[PDB]
Amino acid sequence: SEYDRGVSTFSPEGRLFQVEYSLEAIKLGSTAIGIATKEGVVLGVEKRATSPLLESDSIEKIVEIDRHIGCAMSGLTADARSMIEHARTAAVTHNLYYDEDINVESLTQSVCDLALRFGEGAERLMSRPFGVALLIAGHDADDGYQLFHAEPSGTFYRYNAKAIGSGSEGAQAELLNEWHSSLTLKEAELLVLKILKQVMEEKLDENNAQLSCITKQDGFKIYDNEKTAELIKELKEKEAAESPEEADV
Amino acid sequence: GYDRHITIFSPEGRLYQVEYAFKATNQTNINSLAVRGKDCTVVISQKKVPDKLLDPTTVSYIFCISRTIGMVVNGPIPDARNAALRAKAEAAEFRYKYGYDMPCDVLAKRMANLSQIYTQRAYMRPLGVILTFVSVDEELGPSIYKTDPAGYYVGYKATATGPKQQEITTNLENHFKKSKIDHINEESWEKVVEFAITHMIDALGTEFSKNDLEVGVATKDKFFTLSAENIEERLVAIAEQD
Amino acid sequence: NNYDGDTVTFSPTGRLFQVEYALEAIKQGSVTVGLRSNTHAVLVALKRNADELSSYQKKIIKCDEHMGLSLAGLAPDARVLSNYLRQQCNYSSLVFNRKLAVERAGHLLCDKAQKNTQSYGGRPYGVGLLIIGYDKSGAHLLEFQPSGNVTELYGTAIGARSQGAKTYLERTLDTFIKIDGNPDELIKAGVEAISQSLRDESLTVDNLSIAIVGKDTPFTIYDGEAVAKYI
Amino acid sequence: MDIILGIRVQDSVILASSKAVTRGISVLKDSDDKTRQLSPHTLMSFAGEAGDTVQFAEYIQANIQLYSIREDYELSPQAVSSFVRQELAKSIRSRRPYQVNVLIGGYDKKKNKPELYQIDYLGTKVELPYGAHGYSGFYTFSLLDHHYRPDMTTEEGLDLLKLCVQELEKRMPMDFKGVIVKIVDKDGIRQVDDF
Amino acid sequence: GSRRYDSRTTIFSPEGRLYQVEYALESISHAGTAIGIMASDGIVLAAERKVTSTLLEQDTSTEKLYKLNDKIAVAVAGLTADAEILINTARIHAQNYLKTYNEDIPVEILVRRLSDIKQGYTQHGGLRPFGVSFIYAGYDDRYGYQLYTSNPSGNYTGWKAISVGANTSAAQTLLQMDYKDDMKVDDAIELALKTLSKTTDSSALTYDRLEFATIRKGDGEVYQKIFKPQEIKDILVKTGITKK
Amino acid sequence: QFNPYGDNGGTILGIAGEDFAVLAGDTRNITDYSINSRYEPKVFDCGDNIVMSANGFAADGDALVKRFKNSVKWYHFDHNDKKLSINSAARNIQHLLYGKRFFPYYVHTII
Amino acid sequence: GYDRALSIFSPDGHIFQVEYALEAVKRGTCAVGVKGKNCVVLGCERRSTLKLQDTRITPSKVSKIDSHVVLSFSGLNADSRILIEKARVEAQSHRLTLEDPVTVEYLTRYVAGVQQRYTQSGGVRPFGVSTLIAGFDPRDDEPKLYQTEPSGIYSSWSAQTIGRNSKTVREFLEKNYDRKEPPATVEECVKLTVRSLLEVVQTGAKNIEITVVKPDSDIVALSSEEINQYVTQIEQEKQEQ
Amino acid sequence: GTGYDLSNSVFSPDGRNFQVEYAVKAVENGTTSIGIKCNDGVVFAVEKLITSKLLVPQKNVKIQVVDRHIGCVYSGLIPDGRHLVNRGREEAASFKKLYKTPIPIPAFADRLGQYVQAHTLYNSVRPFGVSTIFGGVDKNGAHLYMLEPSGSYWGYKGAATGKGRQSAKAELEKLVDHHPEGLSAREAVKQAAKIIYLAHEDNKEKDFELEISWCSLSETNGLHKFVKGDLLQEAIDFAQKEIN
Amino acid sequence: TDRYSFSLTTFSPSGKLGQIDYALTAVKQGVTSLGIKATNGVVIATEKKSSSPLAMSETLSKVSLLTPDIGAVYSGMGPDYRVLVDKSRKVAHTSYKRIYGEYPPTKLLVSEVAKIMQEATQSGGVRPFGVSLLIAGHDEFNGFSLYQVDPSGSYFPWKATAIGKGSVAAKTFLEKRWNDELELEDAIHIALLTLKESVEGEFNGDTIELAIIGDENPDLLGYTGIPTDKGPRFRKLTSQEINDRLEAL
Fold first, then answer.
1. What's the CATH number where B94 sits?
2. What Gene Ontology biological process does one annotation of this record name (chain I)?
C-alpha cells in the first residue's frame, strides 16, 4: 500500500512515512562530518565517485551559502540544489533588508521550513520531502561558531560535531570520543580526515574527499586538493608515530 | 472492482451507485401519489412521526418551490431539502432571467439534467431521492412531472412513488382504465383530494387518520399544503360516502 | 488495518485513527509540565537531545508579551501553530489595541487543528501544546491536543511519563493554587511535578527549560544557568 | 529623430543608421550601432523611443537565433519581416506598446535576392527599394526616386547613400554625428570602415 | 479519497516502459492498416477500412485520410475521434505558422509539434494517451517530399516507406523486399496496393474497403489528391488486383 | 475629488551626540488654520533604544510607526532576541517606505 | 489540477519512479562521449540498420543546444525533445540577459535542475532520459563533457557512456583512456570513440554516428565514409592481434 | 461486493452511507446533551465529564451562542461542533446583513442542515462527528431543532443525544405526556437539570458538571443567556433531591 | 473539490478501452432505433416504450430537433441523450450560426457532438456517454446525410442502419430492402416494417416516434415575407400519420 496511502500519512507509531523513508535514503548517502571549535568549523565530505573516469572536481558536496555560512550535503544531492538556492537567497535578502549578516540559526530555520512543504492539494507544494541531510556551519557575533544538522523532518539540531550519511553510525561514535572544548582548527581538520578514512569504503586521498572551513576572519574557504593532501600526509605521519602498548597488563 | 463505488460503467454497462440511490429513495418507508383534477393537481404523502418528541409540524416531504410549483420527495430528508433548495433557487433565477414563472416540466428537466451530471461525473454522488413536481402550468394545464436519481424525467396523468408504488400505480391504472380519461372529472379540488386519499387507502390497505397524511394542492394560481383540520374534513367526507 | 490511511475516514467504531497516531507522536515526545496559581503561570519542560554532541530541542515558545506555550512532539507543527498564535495576538493588539484572550486563542487553535482533521489531503498536527498566559481575566493554562480539544486546567502535563506529573499536580492542587505572589515557589512546584515523571534521568542545567508569566511579569524564558538555582 | 535609411541594390542591401544618441541637451554618444544581426544574412536597424528600441531588437534577435538553432536553418528575410510585423501588431494594442521603427535588410539565399522591409511601430510592413524611418525620408526619397536604378551596384548604392547623408547633414536641424553603414549580401553582413 | 480510483497513466514499469503507451500501441495493432510510400516524384498513402458494411456511405466517408494542409496529409491508424482532435490541433498550428511567417508549415515542425503534444500526454496530466498512430506525407521546399510516422509514445521518425496498424511486420517485410530508391509514384502506388492485398485480413481487396491519396508534382506546384471511390476502383482494376 | 493626503503640520528635530542622541518634536496637531490637539506626541519609543518620528500626514505617520514596531517585534521573534541595530532599523524603514513607492507615506521620517 | 505524488519514497529509501526511468535509459540506444586535448567527440549507436528508414530527416541523437554546446541522450526520444527545447530556450535567454553564451557547466546544471524538479513535482513522472552535454566555454579551449541522469545528478567526465551495454563500453574506456595522455589529435579521439562503440554495436558502421566539437563553435558531424574508414583501420589492427 | 464503507458519499447496496453511520457512532460515544422547548423559549443542558479535578470548573464552555438569540450544544467530536457553530454564525451574519431582521430559527436550521448534507456529498470530506441540539426564539415563537451527521434535522418538543440519550428521551416523553399545556422556562431549567442527572447514570464512570443555557421571551427577553448563580444551584438541588 | 482530474477510461493490456466497450454494451441493451436515407429526405424512427400507461409518452421525445434541417434519435441512456441534445443545440449556434450566420452542416454538427463524446471518454472524472446517436440532416452543399455516433466519439455515414437490441437483425432487413432509387415514403415504409420487426408490444402511432428530414415546410416557418427563407426540413410525424401508414401496411 505504498502508492495507496496519503503522502502525509502518520504511522501507527506517530511518525511520517515519507520522512523516515527519506532518512533511509540519507543513510544510503555519502559521508559528511562537521566539527565546530572555538577557532572555526570544519566540514569534510566523501566525494564517492562512481568510476575513475569521473572528474572528482565536479563533485561539489560542500557549497557556500554566504561568506559566513557554508553547507555540506549527504544523501540525494540533487534535492539539495533547491535548498542551497533558497538558503543563499534568504541570506542575501536578510542582508538587503537589515544591512547585516543573517544568524546561523535563522538561516538553518529558513532552510528547514521547506522540509515539510510536501503533500497533495492546493499554490501547490512538493510530491516528497527532501532526500538529503545538511551540515550548515557558520559564525555570527551572537553565538560564535555554530554547526547545525538539518533533516527533511523540518527539525534541526546544534551539534558540536555531527556525522551524517552511510558511515555516520561509527563516525558519530568516534566523534563523541574525539571531541573536547579545547580542540583547535588543525586538530578538527585532522579528526575529520581520520574519521573519514575510517568510514570510507575507499582509501582516503585528496581526490575522493573534500575539506572546508568557516572562520570569523577569512570566511568560508574550501580547501584546494593540495592543502587537503598536505593535511592527509600530516595525519598519516601523526598516526604512524603513535606508540601505545598493552603487552604487559 | 471499483466500478461499484463511483459512477462508472460496470462490465454489464450498469451504474451501480445509481441503482443504490434508487434503493435509498425508499428509506423513508413512505408512499406518495399524485393525480390531476379538472383544473387542479393533488399530491398525497404518508406522514410517519414515530418519536413523540418530534414537532409534527416540522415533519414534511412536500415543499413549496414557487407560488405555482410544488414538489414531493421520496427519499431521506437531507437530500430532499437539498433538492428543494436547489429547485427553489432555479425557479427564482428562471423568473428573474426570462421574465415569467418557471414551468413545472422545465424545472423537472433542469433537476434531471443535474441528476445526469451526477450520473456521469464521479466527484459527486446521485441524490437518493425521487422528485415529483406538480403545478397548473399556464400553457399545459394540470402537470405532474417526475425525476429520479438516474437523470430520467417524464410527465404522468397520475403517478406513485415509494415501496408500494406498483400497487398504487396499478390501482390508479385500473381507475383510468375504467374512466377512459386522463384526469379526475371533478370541478372542486377537495373532491380530487378525497379521491386520491380513497384510492391510496384502497391500494395500501391501511386506514389513515388526520395526522397520517400530507396533502398538497396546486391550483391555477397557487400551491398550498393542507392543514390537519382540512385533511380531517376530507377524511370525514370520505367516511360519509359509500 | 484499514480506515487508517486518511484523516477523512471515520472507522466502524467512530474513531479517527490518524489523530490517535498524532496523539501517540505526542506521547513519544519529551516531558513538559504546566501549572498556574491565581497570580502566575509556569511551564516546566524537559528538553531531549539526539546524543551527547547535539543540543537540547527548545520546547517553549513565546507567542506574545502575555502568552506562551510549551510543545511536545513534532517541532515543525509546534512552530506552525505558535506562528499562527503570534499572528492572532498581533492582530488583536494592532487592530483592537487589545491583548488576545487566552480562551479565544485556544478556540482559534482548536478550529485551526480541526480544519486539518476533516478534509482530504493534509495530516493533523503532530504536537501537543501547553499554553500559559495572563490576560485581563487572570492566569490561564490550556492543554491543546491535535484532535482539536483544548481544556483549561490549574495544572497538567503531556508527553512521556505525563501521568506522574499529573498525579502529583492533583495531590498538590490545593497547594499550588494558593502560591500567589511568589514566582520562585511556583517554579519549584513545577520542577517537583516534572521530577515526579523522570525515569533513570536527572534534571540538569542543559535539559531543563522554564517559562513564567503573570501579573507584572511578562512571559520570560529561563534556560541554562538561569535554571541552576532551581536544581 | 534618429536617422534610419536603407537601400536595395542588385545582390545587396545597404543600411545606414545615425551614430548619435542624445538624451536632453547633451549628446551622450557619437558611436551607436543602431542595428542587430538577426541572422547571418539578415540585419535589422531600429530607432524610436529610448529603451524600447534596444529591448525589442534584442528580443527579436533572441527569437530568430532560437529558431535558427532549433531547426538548423536560417529563416528567409520575408519570414523574419512577417514575424517582426506580427510582434509589433500585437504590441500596438498592448498595455504599453513598443514605439520602435525598424528596417530589415536580408539576402534570400533560396532566391539569391536582396530584400528590404520597412516596418513602423504600428506594424505597417512594406518591401521597398529604398526606405527610411522618421523625417529622414522627407529628404532622402526625393534624391533616391531620381538617382535609383534597379541594376545598381553596391558601390553605386554607397555613393547614393553618401549623397543622402550629405543632404541630411545640410538641411536637418540636428547633428546625428555621422552614420554607420552595413552591407548585407550573399557573403553575409559587413560594416563599412568609414562613411 | 479519490486516489483509490486513479489509474496512474503516466507511470513507468519496473523495466522502464510506459504502461498506457504499450497498451495504446496494442490497441492500434488491431486497427486498420495504413501504408505510406515516398517515391522520387511524389508520395502515396493507402489505408484499409477495418469496419466495412454494405450500407456504409463511402462517398461521404473519411476515416483514414485527412487533410492537414494543402501540402501535408495524414493516414490514421487507431481511434478516429482522438485522431480528429489531434488533426484539428495540427491544422490550427499549421495555420498559425502560416499567419506568423507568411510561409507554409514545414512538415517536420508540424510532426514534432504533434509528437510533443503526445509526449506531454504521456508525462503529466494523469490522462490517457491518444490511441492514434499517424503517417504524415508532406512537401516543403527544404527537404522536398517527406514521410514521417508518430505513435502514442510521442516518438516520431522518418521513412521511405512505412506501415502502421495491423500486420505491420508482414507489410514492412514486403515493402523492404520490393522497395527501390529510384521507383516512381505509380510504382509506389502498385507496391502499396499489393502490400495491402497481401496483408488484408478480409477475403479480397475491393474499392469500398480502401482510401487512397497521392501528393504529386503535377508546373512547379504540388497537388494533394484524395482518391474518390471510382478512381480507387479504376486503379485496382488496372493494377490487376480486381477484375472489371 | 477625494484627496487621500493631508497635512497636520508639526516640527521634529534630531541631534546626535557623542554617547547619546536626542529626538524632539512639537506636541501640536493641526488641520488648515485650526488646532486639533495640543498634546498628540509624535516621537515614539520603539524599544531597542530606537526612537522614531514620522512628521507630516499624521495617518501615514501612525501607520509607519505601527508597522516599524511590528517589524521589530517580528524581528525579535524570528531572530532569537538580537537587538535591532540602528542601521538595520534604518534599512527596514527604507524598505517600509519604498513599499509604497507609488503611494508614498506623506511623512518625513527621523530615527 | 492533477497533483498526484508519483515520485515518492519507498520504505527502503528508494524513489522507484527514478529507478524505473533509469531502467528506461538502459533500454535506450548507446551513446558515448570522449574528451580530447583540444576536442570532444560524441558517438551514438543506431537501432540496427533498416533500409526503409529516411536517414536525412530522422532526428539525430546529437542535437545542438548552442553553436558551441551539443547534447546527446539515451532513453525516450520524446522526453529528450522537451529537455532539448528547454535547454535551447534557456541558452538564448542567458545570452539575452548576460551578453555571454552559456557555459557547458551552466547548461548541464540547468538540465539537471529541470530533471530534479521533475522528480519532485505532482502529477509528473521523471524523465526517462540520460544526457551527455559536450562543448567548450566561450573564449576557452578546455574541453567540457558532462553527464546528467534522470535523478537530477550531473557530473563531469573524461569519457562516459550511457544506454544499453553501457557497462561494457565503460569498461573499455576505463581500460583504453589514459587520463595522463588524453587523445591529442581529433583522429585519436574519434578512433577511441569508434572502437568503444564497435565493441557493442557488433553491426556495421551505419549504426555508429559521430560528431566532433572543437573550440569557437566548430561542430561537425562525420559522414558515413569517414566512419567506414575508421572501422576499417581499427579492424586492420584486429587482424594483427 | 465489499468495501463500500471506506469512502464517504459511497452508496452501499442497501442505500446507506456507512461513513455517516460511523460518525453517528462517534456521536454516541460523546457526553449527553438535551434541549427542552417550553411555552416561551428553549432550554439547553449538557454534562461536562470531570476527567480530572485539575480542570477549572465553570470554564471549558460547551454551549455556544449564535447571533444573539440562538443556542447550540453538540454531543460528539467537540471540534467539529465548533466548526459547525462558526459556519452557522457566518450564515446568521449574512442573513442579518442582507435581510435586516435576525435570522429565524428555521432558516438557521436549514442552513446548518444544508452545510452538513454538503459534507455528506463528497469523498474528499468526512461527515460531521457531532449531533447538535440548537434553537431559540424568533418572530414565530420558540423553536428547538436537532441535527444529525447525516444532515437530517428535525424540530422537537424535546431532544437528546449522547451516551445517556435513551434515558433523556424517555424523561422527555414523560414530560411531554404530563404537560400538554407546556412547561415554563424556570421549570424547564430544573427539569433539564434533573434529566441530565438521570442520564448521567448511563455514563456514571466519572463525575460531571452541569451546564445550562436558555432563551426565553419572558425570562431573558428573547435573548440566549447562560443560566448561572442562584438558578443553577436551584436546578442542581432539585435534581440532587430527585436522585436521592 | 473535484479531485477526479485523472482519466476514468484507460487502455487495458488487451488494447480495449473498458468504459467504451461497456457503454457500447449499454447501447446494445437499449430500445432499437433506426435510420434510412432516401433521395428526397431521410427518416429516423424508434420505439416509444413507456414504463406505465399513466406516463405520457408524448412528453418524452426520443427524436429531437437540433437545427431546422438536422434532427437526431438515440439508443441507450435517455438522460445522456437529453444532455447531448442540449449541448448540440447550443454548439450549433455558438460554434457556427453566430460565426457564419447559417445553421451548421450535418457533418460538422456530428463532428462537434463526436468531440464532446470523445472528451467525455478522455477527460478526467467522467464516464463516456452511454448512448449511440443517429443524426439525419440536410445542407445545401452536401444534400441529405445520415450519421451514426458511438460512445467512443467515432462517427460513420450510413445509407441505412439501426442500433439497440434488435439492431443486427434489423440491419439485415435494411441490407436486403434498400436501394439507391428510394423515395421518402418508401423509406418510411421500410423503417416502419423494420421497427415492427423490432417491437414486442403494441405497434401504433402512440408507441413509435418517427421524424423526417424531407422537403421544406413553409407552414412551420412562423413568418412570411422573406422568399429566401424557407421552412424547416425536420418534421416529426403525427400519431395520425403513423397510424395511417400502418393502416396501409
1. 3.60.20.10
2. proteasome-mediated ubiquitin-dependent protein catabolic process
